[PDB]
Write a protein that binds this DNA or RNA. Structure first.
Lengths: 60, 48, 49, 166
DNA sequence: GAGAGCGGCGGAGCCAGCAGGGAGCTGGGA
RNA sequence: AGAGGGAACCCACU
DNA sequence: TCCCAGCTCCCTGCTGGCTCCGAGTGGGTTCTGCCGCTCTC
């Protein structure tokens, strides 16, 4: 749950960034291209595989 | 290149500041109070 | 109050484990400090002849 | 097994519902996440056809024993027209969650010894681990200081004679 | 348009350093 | 006809 | 000519910073950027 909270936060941040970038030109976005499952899936896989309990950028 | 063009006299101060960081961190990466040199994947560089 | 032949009673077993853990800890701990002391002494007096 | 079961049953839904709704605008756009769905573990081939994946096949082919996660999102659009149109994207795929073996969401749940032997699984295997890229991984419990309680300590060389923390 | 290549994003123990506090001399007035 | 790398982390031995 | 008040200067005490932390050895694992956008066939 400690990982999933931050990973859902990162998913929401990426969705917001993509949606804002797309609607700054005035067009309506699409949800499936906004959500990237790679963050949650690869982050959980990395944290379980390596044992470094956190983000990939902060191993120390 | 920026010395030939002349720049705006504060980009020169910015580049020399970043050149100061790059030269000194090659000699020593363990400077306190400064960001560590980063190439890749959360692993800091190994200085001399 | 019981010997090893009669068997330690479970409270005595737990207290004996508590006693032996201290010796295990001391054996694990003292090695690094002793090694550092030995290295410092040798590097101080290595060239005296 | 109970820790992972409680995680999947309650904590994922609680984290999803706890996050604030997305407000972003020139036209007012609202995003809300309502309900999560977790399917049984499955594997998509290069053709894309989904098939159930056994833990033994995951071990042999160096796969990850994971299950897809689907969430329901409601999108209400406001373009300054005084009415709003709501659109729901039911079962939106958002990621893969690795599944602890022999839990309530594993494919080996509730199976008999004959079924376990037919699936080439040891009946005496306790489970409780993850298969990540074919390697069996176990999560070790970490001790931490208890929260929400008042403790009083005393330090040696600190300027404070007595300190209480919570 | 597909292929693609590069452009960008804890603890313990010696030194330096400053700050506060007296001797001591010097110009001003007795 | 001498191939053929490295860092990090974990476990274990005396 | 000489008595004070004010400025000068050295020591003392305290705080912050830096470097160190046993010797060998056998296995295992993951990771070695990535999204993108102009560019080329």
């Amino acid at each position: 749950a400690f990982l999933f909270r931050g990973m859902f936060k990162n998913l929401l941040k990426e969705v917001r960034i993509y949606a804002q970038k797309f609607i700054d030109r005035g067009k309506d976005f699409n949800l499936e291209l906004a959500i990237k499952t790679r963050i949650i899936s690869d982050g959980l896989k990395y944290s379980l595989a390596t044992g470094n309990w956190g983000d990939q950028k902060k191993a120390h | 290149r920026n010395e030939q063009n002349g720049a705006a006299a504060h980009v020169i101060a910015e580049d020399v500041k970043l050149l100061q960081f790059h030269v000194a961190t090659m000699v020593d990466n363990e400077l306190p109070g400064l960001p560590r040199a980063m190439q890749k994947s959360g692993r800091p560089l190994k200085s001399l | 109050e019981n010997s090893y032949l009669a068997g330690l009673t479970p409270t005595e077993f737990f207290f004996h484990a508590m006693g032996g853990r201290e010796g295990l800890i001391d054996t694990a701990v003292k090695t690094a400090e002793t090694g550092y002391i030995q290295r410092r002494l040798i590097k101080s007096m290595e060239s005296v002849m | 097994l109970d820790s992972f079961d409680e995680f999947i049953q309650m904590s994922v839904q609680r984290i999803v519902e706890d996050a604030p709704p997305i407000d972003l605008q020139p036209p007012r756009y609202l995003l809300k996440f309502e309900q999560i769905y977790l399917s049984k573990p499955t594997h998509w081939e290069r053709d894309g056809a989904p098939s159930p994946m056994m833990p033994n096949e995951a071990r042999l082919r160096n796969l990850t024993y994971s299950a897809p996660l689907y969430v329901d999102i409601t999108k209400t659009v406001i373009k300054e027209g005084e009415e709003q149109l709501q659109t729901q994207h039911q079962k939106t795929f958002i990621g893969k969650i690795p599944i602890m073996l022999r839990s309530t969401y594993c494919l080996l749940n509730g199976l008999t010894d004959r079924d376990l032997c037919e699936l080439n699984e040891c009946p005496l295997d306790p489970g409780g681990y993850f298969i990540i890229n074919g390697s069996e991984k176990v999560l070790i419990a970490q001790e931490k200081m208890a929260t929400n309680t008042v403790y009083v300590f005393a330090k040696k060389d600190s300027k404070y004679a007595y300190t209480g923390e919570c």
